[PDB]
Symmetry: C3
Subunit: 288 residues, 3 copies
Amino acid sequence: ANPLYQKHIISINDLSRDDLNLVLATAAKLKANPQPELLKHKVIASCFFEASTRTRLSFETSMHRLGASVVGFSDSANTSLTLADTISVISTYVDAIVMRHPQEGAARLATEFSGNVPVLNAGDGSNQHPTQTLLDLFTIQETQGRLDNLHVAMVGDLKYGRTVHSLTQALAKFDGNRFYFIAPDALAMPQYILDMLDEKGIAWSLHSSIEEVMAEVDILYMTRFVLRASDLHNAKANMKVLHPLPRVDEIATDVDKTPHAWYFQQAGNGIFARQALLALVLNRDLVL
Amino acid sequence: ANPLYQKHIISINDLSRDDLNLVLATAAKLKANPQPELLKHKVIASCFFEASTRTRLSFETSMHRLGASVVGFSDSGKKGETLADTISVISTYVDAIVMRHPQEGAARLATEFSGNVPVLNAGDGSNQHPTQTLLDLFTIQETQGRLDNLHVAMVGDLKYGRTVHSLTQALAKFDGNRFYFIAPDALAMPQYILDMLDEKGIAWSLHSSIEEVMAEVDILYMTRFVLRASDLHNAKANMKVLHPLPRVDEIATDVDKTPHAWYFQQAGNGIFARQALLALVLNRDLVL
Amino acid sequence: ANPLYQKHIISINDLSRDDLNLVLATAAKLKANPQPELLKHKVIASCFFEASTRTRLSFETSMHRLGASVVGFSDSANTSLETLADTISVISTYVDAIVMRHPQEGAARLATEFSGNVPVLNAGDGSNQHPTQTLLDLFTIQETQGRLDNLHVAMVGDLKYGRTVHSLTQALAKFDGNRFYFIAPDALAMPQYILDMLDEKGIAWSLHSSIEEVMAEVDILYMTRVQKERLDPSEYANVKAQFVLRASDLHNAKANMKVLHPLPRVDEIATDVDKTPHAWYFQQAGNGIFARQALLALVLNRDL
Ligand SMILES: [Ca+2]
Ligand SMILES: [Ca+2]
């Protein structure tokens, strides 16, 4: 019944504003009221071809919080592993496949072999990572009370930073958002993103420092240009500092103590996002 | 209690028809009518000393489909001395041990130290592999409606291929079967096998191509002679192509599309053959 | 009372006699009547940053025995792991409890600083603390000896690097009038600090050259493996077990005597002992399930 029922979740680009809204709403609903037996008789494959601990643990916890069983591998390194044949087989054992693969396009390729077994992409090479964007959006909505009319600053390697690409694209599905791109000249936000914004009549601008935008942003999204506690003197009371993680020198730990730090809470939201995705995909009926 | 109750399952040869048939009927029961809570209070150890991804995923899923909890390792029992001790310890924890060990003899040894805890061999070296044979037989039974009076063709490396040996051996336990061996001269089916067929009056014959017998075959069991869709033009409506997997080049993808292609379905049957053993070993009587 | 509710379990030093008792009593309870759903609906993280198969399987079985769900890693090499601090900061937002084993000493402690309201249970911290081992050892002694006071306990083997005996000894000393016998290589002797601790408490101890010399007097024979991987190069000679227990040594053993070994064992315990009534190292390992269950239950369940 639900629009996401039995669908593959490969790219954030396949999710419409409505779809995003749907997942986000579900997520909050589940966060409000758990459904420990929602996926009681399901077995889900957690196929981590390339290890990604946080994501895997997040995803598996979500499974368990819905009542599902889990089988899988956390890395291929030590396994006995065509990807195609691998998928055709696993597809005969499980109700859904969550897969993270080292090669971009893998997830998409898997959908051609899973039969009608949904494939949820948990990281495709660098490329696409739908649940990361979802939990990012969820966090913004939650903290911000909305996904429209926000001032959003993205700091770091914007050239290669794909979570930033995906999140920009997703936020751009909403209305009245204003972007600030803070990157070194050599690692700038790609034209293609800029063009897309222009296509939607979305305002964006470039900056050489966070200082420049601090006072105006609601969301400060960091990527590996360094953020220290003192940098927030003039932050907005509602401003939140996000980071898909992990971090490094990029965000000083003295930031962790500030009310702006929200990267761990952000991470904690992957549970609700993942749970929402799983529930909609595997369940016909809605999350009353 | 069923005849397999609390029994070790090391080699299919330990099994008798009353057993295979039991296992087979049970696997069919579960296939139709799942018992999600059959092994609810059991904890099973999944001990893959050497990675066997498909088998382990298959087995754990089986465990879950029955409601058992799972503990274990995917890859690693190098020495008989420490191995015995490992088994000794583990067996104070779980209800059953599912093990795959690369050193032939290892599974039998474990039984010496497991106390009252049943040991199920998931792959002993590159030799004993009871569950593989059971899943093959079940697949044949399931698709052919019987195990007797069948025309079976075995193709590939019939020399160093233990699965074929066992399958042939098992199949020989039934009546009216006729075999076709298609192997390169250097990889021919072993004389001893031939002799046992002889002992029972079972008719067999060697062929240079699949094409020559295609019209007679009920079961086409492939190992590794490239099988292609074109080869099947004259196949019997009921004919199924089987392959224990993995496959490399021996079966062309175009076959995959054909109705005869059953290696994926065969792999899926692994879930039911394995559930059936787990169930028979750990549950007194699963009323059918 | 459950003074253990939501408490971090980092060290045995942190646990009082009442605490120990509470833990052992619960274990006995659980053993008698398991509570297969006591922890249904909890998700526990099994983080073996340092692989430890037997200990890991024990802990996890315990979890399942209570109906909890488990997530985790068997070793850090098969992971993508970023600070431990950030790691715990993240995981603690998903799970109800974190069971951790780590190569560095004080790692578990540090985890407590970042876990928020999530209890951290130490399954091995460098060459430091290993609380549940000590718990299962105590439970084993108490079950077979019917008590934890006024016992004659021998500890044999690598006493220099044997943290489990250092720990077991501290715990035992929390009980009344235990008597210890230390049988170790000249070079892998029990540390001064433990000795000074015993003196302090007026607890008697003595050094021995053999197991035979104490066989007749002991209730518990606690065997250890040489900590090969911790041995200094001026200690390389001490690699081979200096003391081997063989079945023939049991001839004058007290009837109630039990041979324990935290495992795994190298040469120190010959196989012929395994079939004697004195061999109790496998039973001991089995009791790891009850003790681990007990600790989880207390930490995660308000009421006993
Ligand atoms: Ca709006
Ligand atoms: Ca705290």
